[PDB]
């Protein structure tokens, strides 16, 4: 219900943009946390973005592949933070398992990938992030299905 498209020529643009995205994120608190869905062909500016988001904040380290696992978490400038890889998940059983850990409450920004499996426990996202990519560069609509999404996008001008 609110779209927004952005051109990303190379690395450093995924990072300005990656990191530019989150501070908007960080200024508004949460009743039900800020859903944010990551979506592209594997290897299309996914991780690059993710890091861009976390290290554009104060993550001195590495974004640990959330592969062998599911939710790797952080906590930054008055916000907890959780990456999610839903790839090795077929059963949402395992989605019901972390959420019981204070992941959806006050001060919680959950950023998730492979949302196919996150249809049950897993909420619907305020900001649907879809990332285009051909030869060198990338594209990305910042679309918002809900009300936080309508105004998180709007935050970019």
Annotated binding site for ATP: 11, 43-48, 136
User: With respect to Hg ion, which residue has the nearer C-beta, 49 or 111?
Assistant: 111
Q: By CB under 5 A, how many residues form the interface with Hg ion? A: 2
Please report whether residue 122 would count as binding Hg ion according to CB under 5 A: no
The Cα–Cα gap between 90 and 49 comes to 25
Are 146 and 69 within 8 A, CB to CB?
no
CB of 96 within 8 A of CB of 117?
A: no
User: Under a CB-based contact definition with an 8 Å cutoff, are residues 39 and 129 in contact?
Assistant: yes
Q: Are 18 and 53 in contact (CB under 8 A)?
A: yes
Q: Does 53 bind Hg ion (CB under 5 A)?
A: no
Q: Which stretch binds Hg ion (CB under 5 A): 2-10, 23-31, 108-116, 129-137?
A: 108-116
Under the binding rule (CB under 5 A), the answer on residue 70 touching Hg ion is: no
The CA distances from residue 12 to 19, 78, 126, 130, in Å, are 10, 26, 26, 18
Per CB under 5 A, 129 contacts Hg ion:
no
By beta carbon distance, the residue nearest Hg ion is 110
What minimum distance in Å lies between the beta carbon of 103 and Hg ion? 5
53, 98, 110, 127: which one contacts Hg ion (CB under 5 A)? 110
For Hg ion, the binding residues (CB under 5 A) are 103, 110
């Amino acid at each position: 219900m609110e779209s927004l498209t952005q051109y990303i020529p190379d690395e450093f643009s995924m990072l300005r943009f990656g990191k530019k995205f989150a501070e908007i994120l960080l200024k508004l608190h949460t009743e039900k946390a800020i859903m944010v869905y990551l979506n592209g062909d594997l290897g299309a500016g996914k991780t690059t973005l993710t890091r861009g988001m976390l290290q554009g904040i104060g993550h001195q380290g590495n974004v640990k592949s959330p592969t062998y696992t599911l939710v790797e978490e952080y906590n930054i400038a008055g916000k907890m933070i959780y990456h999610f890889d839903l790839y090795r998940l077929a059963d949402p059983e395992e989605l019901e398992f972390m959420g019981i850990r204070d992941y959806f409450n006050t001060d919680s920004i959950c950023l998730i990938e492979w949302s196919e499996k996150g249809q049950g426990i897993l909420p619907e996202a305020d900001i649907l992030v879809n990332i285009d990519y051909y030869d060198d560069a990338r594209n990305i609509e910042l679309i918002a299905q809900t009300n936080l999404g309508k105004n998180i996008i709007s935050a970019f001008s």
